[PDB]
UniProtKB/Swiss-Prot annotation:
<comment type="function">
    <text>Is involved in the reduction of 2,3-digeranylgeranylglycerophospholipids (unsaturated archaeols) into 2,3-diphytanylglycerophospholipids (saturated archaeols) in the biosynthesis of archaeal membrane lipids. Catalyzes the formation of archaetidic acid (2,3-di-O-phytanyl-sn-glyceryl phosphate) from 2,3-di-O-geranylgeranylglyceryl phosphate (DGGGP) via the hydrogenation of each double bond of the isoprenoid chains. Is not active with NADPH or NADH as an electron donor; the physiological reducing agent is unknown.</text>
</comment>
<dbReference type="InterPro" id="IPR054715">
    <property type="entry name" value="GGR_cat"/>
</dbReference>
<dbReference type="GO" id="GO:0006650">
    <property type="term" value="P:glycerophospholipid metabolic process"/>
</dbReference>
<feature type="binding site">
    <location>
        <begin position="300"/>
        <end position="301"/>
    </location>
    <ligand>
        <name>FAD</name>
    </ligand>
</feature>
<feature type="binding site">
    <location>
        <position position="288"/>
    </location>
    <ligand>
        <name>FAD</name>
    </ligand>
</feature>
<feature type="binding site">
    <location>
        <position position="297"/>
    </location>
    <ligand>
        <name>a 2,3-bis-O-phytanyl-sn-glycerol 1-phospholipid</name>
    </ligand>
</feature>
<keyword id="KW-0443">Lipid metabolism</keyword>
<feature type="binding site">
    <location>
        <begin position="35"/>
        <end position="36"/>
    </location>
    <ligand>
        <name>FAD</name>
    </ligand>
</feature>
<keyword id="KW-0285">Flavoprotein</keyword>
<protein>
    <recommendedName>
        <fullName>Digeranylgeranylglycerophospholipid reductase</fullName>
        <ecNumber>1.3.-.-</ecNumber>
    </recommendedName>
</protein>
<feature type="disulfide bond">
    <location>
        <begin position="310"/>
        <end position="335"/>
    </location>
</feature>
<dbReference type="InterPro" id="IPR036188">
    <property type="entry name" value="FAD/NAD-bd_sf"/>
</dbReference>
<dbReference type="Pfam" id="PF01266">
    <property type="entry name" value="DAO"/>
</dbReference>
<comment type="similarity">
    <text>Belongs to the geranylgeranyl reductase family.</text>
</comment>
<feature type="binding site">
    <location>
        <position position="340"/>
    </location>
    <ligand>
        <name>a 2,3-bis-O-phytanyl-sn-glycerol 1-phospholipid</name>
    </ligand>
</feature>
<feature type="binding site">
    <location>
        <begin position="45"/>
        <end position="50"/>
    </location>
    <ligand>
        <name>FAD</name>
    </ligand>
</feature>
<keyword id="KW-1208">Phospholipid metabolism</keyword>
């Protein structure tokens, strides 16, 4: 078959891959990005479509504008299971037309010299002399099977991890997802019969009964249009997510016009610390494929962008040292762990605690303001549940006279602090990965057993 040579091959053009392509562009490298979807569909994986302004500001990424921005967001209303307590957390964000925004990023990368092939699937890794060296591609548009050699593959295939999963199982880069370390999530976008009240606020409903291990949401995309959905924890033996959706839609969105459903669909959402390494010989993994999603709230588009930025920085470094080994690309890990990954680890711990609380516990915690709105935001945005905050909460939790997981909150805050420090001491070279990964697994297993 035809053979071509590129500096970098990016597989997948979602928020992650498009960010890597945009960040890598005009820097002296010959870059190809492929995606299985046609151009007009790239970026259309089911999603709530809500992204913090802070993630854009973190990277100085351009804001969505015009048709890309469906609705400006000014905060979130968090509802207790019993619906009796509502927290308002202020904070700026965007309700996107994700395909339009994603497609703009790709088009700008393309304008800056990135080559893009839509309707093109990476089918088989080229793995030779112990390195990823490219991919066999199938271009549906030309009916051509092609070999593309690359010094670095950026694996951005989303939740399918379709390319890295084909590599030798020996490689750290083939790390799999445990069923309990992901949610399945499902959403619909519908027009509403009435104008949406406070249409600039997202609504999140916590209820361990109607969305076990996740939550329900109501994300307005305009005055009369809403993205409504839920996520539930995987690996727990729960019934189909669409059963919960059908049963409880009316509770959360009594105002939707079912005759005006616009889109619907679901997908897997990783909810854990990132891949232990996001780099190996000839390859970096980003976005959902590298488990970059916030484990507490399930937001992954901002972290996908961050991972793409770190991949760009790492790759430029590798070309400046002629070194495409894991060691040569290792800055990917250092960059990502400092920007988001250490936070994700702390939040992976926090999520495990939250998923085991009862509705009674959550009703109590929210009613009693055991932590403040701002503290919960700090946990989300920084991965930090300060020990002083945990101490204050424990003083309130001390007044409860029934058994409750809430009594472990200080212990949870301590483990969150420990794992965060462990991640910020990420190994400086691959020869220390094993030792460190064992320390992390030990922290996690200890923590898991401390919750019973
Ligand atoms: C229902 C639901 C709701 C939400 C969310 C998820 C889900 C399922 N999330 C998560 C967020 O949607 C997700 O984390 C990011 O879109 C992931 O971006 P990626 O680029 O990693 O994957 P994404 O899946 O977007 O892109 C991967 C691309 O790779 C392509 N591909 C795969 N294999 C290939 C191959 N072998 N060859 C070529 N192409 C290949 C696919 O066609 C696809 O375009 C979220 N996050 C958030 O920030 N805000 C929110 O409101 C929500 N809500
Ligand atoms: C502002 C970003 C928040 C939107 C995230 C929506 C993600 C939906 C999936 C929820 C499942 C994760 C809960 C643990």
């Amino acid at each position: 078959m035809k053979e071509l040579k590129y500096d970098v091959l990016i597989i997948g053009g979602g928020f992650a891959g498009s960010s890597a392509a945009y960040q890598l562009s005009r820097r002296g490298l010959k870059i190809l990005l492929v995606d299985s979807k046609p151009w007009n569909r790239i970026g259309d994986k089911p999603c709530g479509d809500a992204v913090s302004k802070a993630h854009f500001d973190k990277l100085g990424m351009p804001y969505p504008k015009g048709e890309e921005l469906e609705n400006k967001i000014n905060g979130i209303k968090l509802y207790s299971p019993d619906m009796q307590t509502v927290w308002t957390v202020n904070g700026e964000g965007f309700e996107l037309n994700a395909p339009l925004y994603n497609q703009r990023v790709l088009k700008e990368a393309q304008d800056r010299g990135v080559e893009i092939w839509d309707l093109t699937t990476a089918m088989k890794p080229i793995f030779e002399d112990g390195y990823v060296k490219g991919a066999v591609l199938f271009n549906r548009r030309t009916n051509e099977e092609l070999t593309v050699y690359s010094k670095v593959v950026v694996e951005a295939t989303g939740y399918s991890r379709s390319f890295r999963s084909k590599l030798p199982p020996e490689l750290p880069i083939t790390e799999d997802l445990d069923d309990k370390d992901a949610d399945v999530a499902y959403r619909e976008v519908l027009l509403t019969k009435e104008d949406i009240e406070d249409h600039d606020y997202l609504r999140i409903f916590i209820d361990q009964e109607t969305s076990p291990g996740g939550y329900w949401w109501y994300f307005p995309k305009g005055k009369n249009k809403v993205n409504v959905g839920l996520g539930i924890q995987g690996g727990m033996g729960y019934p189909s997510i669409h059963e919960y959706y059908k049963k409880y839609l009316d509770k959360y969105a009594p105002d939707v016009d079912k005759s005006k459903l616009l889109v619907k669909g679901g997908a897997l959402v990783p909810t854990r610390r990132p891949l232990y390494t996001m780099a190996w010989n000839g390859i970096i993994v980003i976005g959902d494929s590298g488990f970059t999603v916030n484990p507490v709230h399930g937001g992954g588009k901002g972290s996908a962008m961050i991972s793409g930025y770190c991949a760009a920085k790492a790759i430029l470094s590798a070309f400046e040292t002629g070194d495409f080994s894991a060691s040569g690309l290792w800055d990917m890990n250092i960059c990502y762990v400092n920007e988001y990954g250490a936070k994700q680890a702390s939040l992976d711990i926090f999520r495990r605690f939250l998923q085991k609380l009862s509705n009674d516990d959550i009703n109590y915690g929210m009613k009693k303001k055991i932590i403040k709105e701002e503290d919960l935001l700090e946990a989300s945005e920084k991965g930090d549940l300060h020990l002083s905050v945990a101490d204050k909460a424990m003083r309130v939790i001390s007044g409860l006279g029934r058994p409750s997981l809430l009594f472990k909150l200080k212990a949870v805050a301590e483990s969150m602090k420990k794992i965060k420090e462990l991640y910020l001491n990420y190994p400086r070279s691959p020869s220390s990965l094993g030792s460190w990964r064992r320390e992390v697994d030990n922290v996690l297993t200890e923590f898991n057993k401390s919750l019973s």
